[PDB]
Design an enzyme around this catalytic site. Structure first.
Site, PDB file in Angstrom:
ATOM      1  N   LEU A  82     -16.251 -50.838   7.396  1.00 12.96           N
ATOM      2  CA  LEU A  82     -15.377 -50.450   6.297  1.00 12.96           C
ATOM      3  C   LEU A  82     -13.910 -50.403   6.720  1.00 12.96           C
ATOM      4  CD1 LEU A  82     -17.356 -47.519   4.631  1.00 12.96           C
ATOM      5  CD2 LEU A  82     -17.260 -49.918   3.948  1.00 12.96           C
ATOM      6  N   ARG A 117     -11.213 -50.188  10.694  1.00 10.27           N
ATOM      7  CA  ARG A 117     -10.995 -50.110  12.127  1.00 10.27           C
ATOM      8  C   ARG A 117      -9.690 -49.353  12.340  1.00 10.27           C
ATOM      9  NH1 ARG A 117     -11.510 -55.643  15.832  1.00 10.27           N
ATOM     10  NH2 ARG A 117     -12.993 -54.817  17.371  1.00 10.27           N
ATOM     11  N   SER A 168     -11.313 -45.138  16.323  1.00  7.68           N
ATOM     12  CA  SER A 168     -12.549 -45.093  15.534  1.00  7.68           C
ATOM     13  C   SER A 168     -12.811 -46.369  14.729  1.00  7.68           C
ATOM     14  CB  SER A 168     -12.548 -43.888  14.594  1.00  7.68           C
ATOM     15  OG  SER A 168     -11.665 -44.075  13.498  1.00  7.68           O
ATOM     16  N   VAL A 204     -15.212 -47.304  11.216  1.00  3.12           N
ATOM     17  CA  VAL A 204     -15.989 -46.719  10.133  1.00  3.12           C
ATOM     18  C   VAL A 204     -16.933 -47.735   9.490  1.00  3.12           C
ATOM     19  CG1 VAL A 204     -15.902 -45.418   7.992  1.00  3.12           C
ATOM     20  CG2 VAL A 204     -14.175 -45.047   9.741  1.00  3.12           C
ATOM     21  N   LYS A 253     -18.875 -42.819  11.298  1.00  2.00           N
ATOM     22  CA  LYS A 253     -17.610 -43.004  12.004  1.00  2.00           C
ATOM     23  C   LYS A 253     -17.857 -42.989  13.507  1.00  2.00           C
ATOM     24  CE  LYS A 253     -12.925 -40.987  12.063  1.00  2.00           C
ATOM     25  NZ  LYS A 253     -12.129 -39.813  11.620  1.00  2.00           N
ATOM     26  N   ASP A 262      -1.828 -36.182   8.522  1.00  2.00           N
ATOM     27  CA  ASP A 262      -1.935 -37.634   8.387  1.00  2.00           C
ATOM     28  C   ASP A 262      -2.220 -38.015   6.964  1.00  2.00           C
ATOM     29  OD1 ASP A 262      -1.668 -40.270   9.327  1.00  2.00           O
ATOM     30  OD2 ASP A 262      -3.711 -40.352  10.116  1.00  2.00           O
TER      31      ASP A 262
HETATM   32  O1  LIG Z   1     -10.093 -45.849   4.882  1.00  2.00           O
HETATM   33  C1  LIG Z   1     -10.879 -46.328   4.070  1.00  2.00           C
HETATM   34  C2  LIG Z   1     -12.300 -46.669   4.464  1.00  2.00           C
HETATM   35  C3  LIG Z   1     -13.182 -45.442   4.545  1.00  2.00           C
HETATM   36  O2  LIG Z   1     -14.083 -45.257   3.735  1.00  2.00           O
HETATM   37  N1  LIG Z   1     -12.904 -44.605   5.568  1.00  2.00           N
HETATM   38  C4  LIG Z   1     -13.523 -43.366   5.852  1.00  2.00           C
HETATM   39  C5  LIG Z   1     -14.545 -42.905   5.034  1.00  2.00           C
HETATM   40  C6  LIG Z   1     -15.069 -41.639   5.228  1.00  2.00           C
HETATM   41  C7  LIG Z   1     -14.583 -40.832   6.241  1.00  2.00           C
HETATM   42  C8  LIG Z   1     -13.581 -41.292   7.084  1.00  2.00           C
HETATM   43  C9  LIG Z   1     -12.989 -40.395   8.111  1.00  2.00           C
HETATM   44  O3  LIG Z   1     -12.105 -40.952   8.866  1.00  2.00           O
HETATM   45  O4  LIG Z   1     -13.274 -39.217   8.172  1.00  2.00           O
HETATM   46  C10 LIG Z   1     -13.060 -42.567   6.891  1.00  2.00           C
HETATM   47  N2  LIG Z   1     -10.535 -46.613   2.820  1.00  2.00           N
HETATM   48  C11 LIG Z   1      -9.149 -46.618   2.377  1.00  2.00           C
HETATM   49  C12 LIG Z   1      -8.960 -46.014   1.006  1.00  2.00           C
HETATM   50  C13 LIG Z   1      -7.545 -46.212   0.514  1.00  2.00           C
HETATM   51  N3  LIG Z   1      -7.277 -45.474  -0.718  1.00  2.00           N
HETATM   52  C14 LIG Z   1      -6.247 -46.102  -1.541  1.00  2.00           C
HETATM   53  C15 LIG Z   1      -5.407 -45.112  -2.309  1.00  2.00           C
HETATM   54  C16 LIG Z   1      -5.992 -44.083  -3.023  1.00  2.00           C
HETATM   55  C17 LIG Z   1      -5.229 -43.214  -3.781  1.00  2.00           C
HETATM   56  C18 LIG Z   1      -3.845 -43.350  -3.848  1.00  2.00           C
HETATM   57  C19 LIG Z   1      -3.090 -42.501  -4.810  1.00  2.00           C
HETATM   58  C20 LIG Z   1      -3.542 -42.327  -6.116  1.00  2.00           C
HETATM   59  C21 LIG Z   1      -2.840 -41.537  -7.011  1.00  2.00           C
HETATM   60  C22 LIG Z   1      -1.680 -40.911  -6.620  1.00  2.00           C
HETATM   61  C23 LIG Z   1      -1.213 -41.075  -5.335  1.00  2.00           C
HETATM   62  C24 LIG Z   1      -1.909 -41.865  -4.435  1.00  2.00           C
HETATM   63  C25 LIG Z   1      -3.264 -44.352  -3.086  1.00  2.00           C
HETATM   64 CL1  LIG Z   1      -1.537 -44.493  -3.002  1.00  2.00          CL
HETATM   65  C26 LIG Z   1      -4.025 -45.231  -2.342  1.00  2.00           C
END
Ligand SMILES: O=C(CC(=O)Nc1cccc(C(=O)O)c1)NCCCNCc1ccc(-c2ccccc2)c(Cl)c1
Length: 325
Positions: free
Chosen positions: A42, A44, A48, A50, A65, A153
């Site tokens: 999902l 990198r 970590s 994911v 993760k 972060d």
């Molecule tokens: O990182 C990942 C993959 C993932 O599933 N990582 C993950 C999952 C679960 C746990 C972990 C962890 O590191 O704990 C990491 N996905 C990226 C998602 C990006 N989201 C886009 C986004 C979402 C919401 C917004 C937003 C919406 C309204 C107002 C302001 C901001 C933005 Cl700008 C962008």
């Protein structure tokens, strides 16, 4: 430099026992990873990777993760914070902790969240959607701050949105830390575009308010359709990009209030900049997302002085959220 402390939840860790915040002494009990089957990658990161996965015992999707065990103390810190925040509103849920029997590589198992592709969502987002999701993030921040934790972060990459079920999760607690008043923290946190001025001027006695600056950066990029809002090319230039909007007069007021020594690297790049009106960022492509309430809210988040920014609770009471539940 002049000391500082959080305006809110100042003494929450002070009044709790050692077990809650002493993550180095926390006992991590790793289960067996054989219950999980990895599906696809999902994302990198630096330390970590994911994966989307399936729990074979209940046929339920999870997120695994895998952590590069570069520093055990940092893994223990993340585990303890996730355990402490487990079940809080819009906090990613840690469901298990595993180690693959043969590799012994640490892995965290979370609840599955079906992330809608942002590039696609970004175009269809309305004024209401931004307010609604901003509010969801605020619930997560007021909760973790109440629990004596700074995320450190906050950025789009660390926010997950399942638009179909209007679900939001604040993820990646790898840089999160316990807030202890008077503590001097490492300023090498957050991602460049979202770093608060405290980090850029090397003011170590920061607090939860760092998260509110990062949130302000996200709000600005979303309503103005400008990603990132403050586009620095390095950490020193990042402060110059902020000063091109907030102006240099208020920057000198900030460093003077805390008796901060401005690094000489700023001498030839900072220049002189007027304070810009937030209305200057309004254009035909973004005017449908901008309102006087949004600009007033943004103006109360994007302040040099970490102490003068809205706390997550005060932000939740702002008129910009009078249309959300
Ligand atoms: O990182 C990942 C993959 C993932 O599933 N990582 C993950 C999952 C679960 C746990 C972990 C962890 O590191 O704990 C990491 N996905 C990226 C998602 C990006 N989201 C886009 C986004 C979402 C919401 C917004 C937003 C919406 C309204 C107002 C302001 C901001 C933005 Cl700008 C962008």
């Amino acid at each position: 430099p002049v000391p500082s402390r959080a305006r809110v939840y100042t003494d929450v860790n002070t009044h709790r026992p050692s077990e809650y915040w002493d993550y180095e002494s926390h006992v991590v009990e790793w289960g067996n990873q054989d219950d999980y089957q990895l599906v696809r990658k999902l994302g990198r990161g630096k330390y970590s990777e994911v994966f989307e996965a399936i729990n074979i015992t209940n046929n339920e999707k999870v997120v695994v993760k895998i952590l590069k065990p570069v520093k055990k103390k940092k893994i223990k810190r993340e585990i303890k914070i996730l355990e402490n925040l487990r079940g809080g509103p819009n906090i990613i849920t840690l469901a298990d902790i595993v180690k693959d029997p043969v590799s012994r590589t640490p892995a965290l198992v979370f609840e599955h969240v079906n992330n809608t592709d942002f590039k696609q969502l970004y175009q269809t987002l309305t004024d209401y959607d931004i307010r609604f999701y901003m509010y969801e993030i605020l619930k997560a921040l007021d909760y973790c701050h109440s629990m004596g934790i700074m995320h450190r972060d906050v950025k789009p990459h660390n926010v997950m949105i399942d638009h179909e079920h209007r679900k939001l999760r604040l993820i990646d607690w790898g840089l999160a830390e316990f807030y202890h008043p008077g503590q001097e923290y490492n300023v090498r946190v957050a991602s460049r575009y979202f770093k608060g001025p405290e980090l850029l001027v090397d003011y170590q006695m920061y607090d939860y308010s760092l998260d509110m600056w990062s949130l302000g950066c996200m709000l600005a990029s979303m309503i103005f359709r400008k990603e990132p809002f403050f586009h620095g090319h390095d950490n020193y230039d990042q402060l110059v990009r902020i000063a091109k909007v907030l102006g240099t007069e208020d920057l000198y007021d900030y460093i003077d209030k805390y008796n901060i020594e401005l690094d000489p690297r700023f001498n030839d790049i900072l220049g002189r900049h007027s304070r810009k009106r937030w209305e200057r960022f309004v254009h035909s492509e973004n005017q449908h997302l901008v309102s006087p309430e949004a600009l007033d809210f943004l103006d109360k988040l994007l302040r040099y002085d970490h102490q003068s920014r809205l706390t997550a609770r005060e932000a939740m009471e702002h008129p910009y959220f009078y249309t959300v539940v």
